[PDB]
Amino acid sequence: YEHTAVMPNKVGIPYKALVERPGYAPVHLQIQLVNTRIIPSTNLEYITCKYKTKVPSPVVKCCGATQCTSKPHPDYQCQVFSGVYPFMWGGAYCFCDTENTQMSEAYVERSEECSIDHAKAYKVHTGTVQAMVNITYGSVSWRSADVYVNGETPAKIGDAKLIIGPLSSAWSPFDNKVVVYGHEVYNYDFPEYGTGKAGSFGDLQSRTSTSNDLYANTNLKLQRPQAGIVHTPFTQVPSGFERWKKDKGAPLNDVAPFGCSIALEPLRAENCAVGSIPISIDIPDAAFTRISETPTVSDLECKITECTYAFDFGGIATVAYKSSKAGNCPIHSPSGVAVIKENDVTLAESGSFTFHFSTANIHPAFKLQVCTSAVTCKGDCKPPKDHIVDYPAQHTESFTSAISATAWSWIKVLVGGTSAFIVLGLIATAVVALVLFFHRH
């Protein structure tokens, strides 16, 4: 047989459904999600890290002049300073006064911490969504294997093929450009490897951590050495990667809506709760027994003994039956008012059992089916005294959940007497029209 329905996109709450093959005993089916990972497709453009400017030894040809070529180096610098007359240890360097030459070249390269901490720049594109489901049906125990969340690919779990339908929302928490620094990801724009504004993020850009081509503009400017010493000074703006580490805002795993938890190694966005997921499960024909070998109940009367508004299993109801024979048969409430904690019950000849439920209604008018037979339950509920708890709701809050019997009485008094007032005006209008017509002829 095949049972198709739609489940909500919530993780810790199982979805209970009762398949109904006529002529066979019903099978209680329970589908529970474990994970929900939205995995986009990324490509790595470039990385970035703090630089380390290295200075070669300057040449001192100090009777004459020297010139340089243009070596291929990121942010390479040349200068010639004339008439320096330096003073090393053990006297002055050379005899020629007031005409000298010092080169003092410089060159920018990446540091040795770039292997440990760096920021990876990614462009994302919408990709696969997959999830892990824990399932059971009938007497089969819990067996789990992960599926693909698209309405095409079936997955064999146990002996039943499950086709998890597409999500109703196309929402993904990643913008088109993300930065992955260490443990957390961000939503930040790139200069796209061509430009670098020397102080914000792309002062140093490298395509791979071991790559040989480097982009570097750090405004490296050479400076004249002073007072007759051999050293090479320079001035440059600080690294923007070190500045980005100070000013970075909150990461994406702290501002994500719908309670998404962001993981890293395939760049998942795990356990979001948005939309709904349709299902379609093909159940094997060997899991159905004939109805002549199962209990069948009649004369059902349902009484609710205690009900509580809270979203904990505080609702209790006992029903009275008289089955045809002893055995086990499941229970289920198909309406959206209350969920049922129990899966199956053990029966006898003319006994009574109790089940625990959970509802968000003041007056639960739900019905439940036991042993392919339905019975309507009614009662009143009281609010709880706890204000904040640390578990999610088991039920679903509707629109007319909070309206009580006294509030319905005041609405019907208001609506009923308003229309009765305005109809009496319409009745009395048509009454004097007849007696004015009857005056003439």
Binding site: D254, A256, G259, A402
Partner: protein, 105 residues
């Protein structure tokens, strides 16, 4: 090894979580809501302060210090009672739906 903050004193009111924080170092406290909008707060606590956070039925998640994050959900307790005189029915639905009964009356 990084320092661990002292535990806050949590106090519960109707749709409000109150946190009494007594740190000894400048400590980061970041919260978010588990609904369609995150509405995120982020601040460094240096002196002993108290902060009140509004928790709806969707949830709230707060991280304090180097502790693991904790999630809290708000129930439907309320203040009035729905059965009774009209000065009690109106009060109960105002504490539950504060805007809908203003334009509903």
């Amino acid at each position: 090894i990084a320092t661990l903050a002292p535990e806050p004193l949590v106090e519960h009111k109707h749709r409000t979580l109150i946190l009494h924080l007594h740190p000894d170092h400048p400590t980061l406290l970041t919260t978010r809501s588990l609904g369609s909008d995150a509405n995120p707060t982020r601040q460094w606590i240096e002196r002993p302060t108290t902060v009140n956070f509004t928790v709806t039925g969707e949830g709230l998640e707060y991280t304090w210090g180097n502790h693991p994050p904790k999630r809290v959900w708000a129930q439907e307790s309320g203040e009035g009672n729905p059965h009774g005189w009209p000065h009690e029915v109106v009060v109960y639905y105002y504490n539950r739906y504060p805007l809908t009964t203003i334009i509903g009356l």
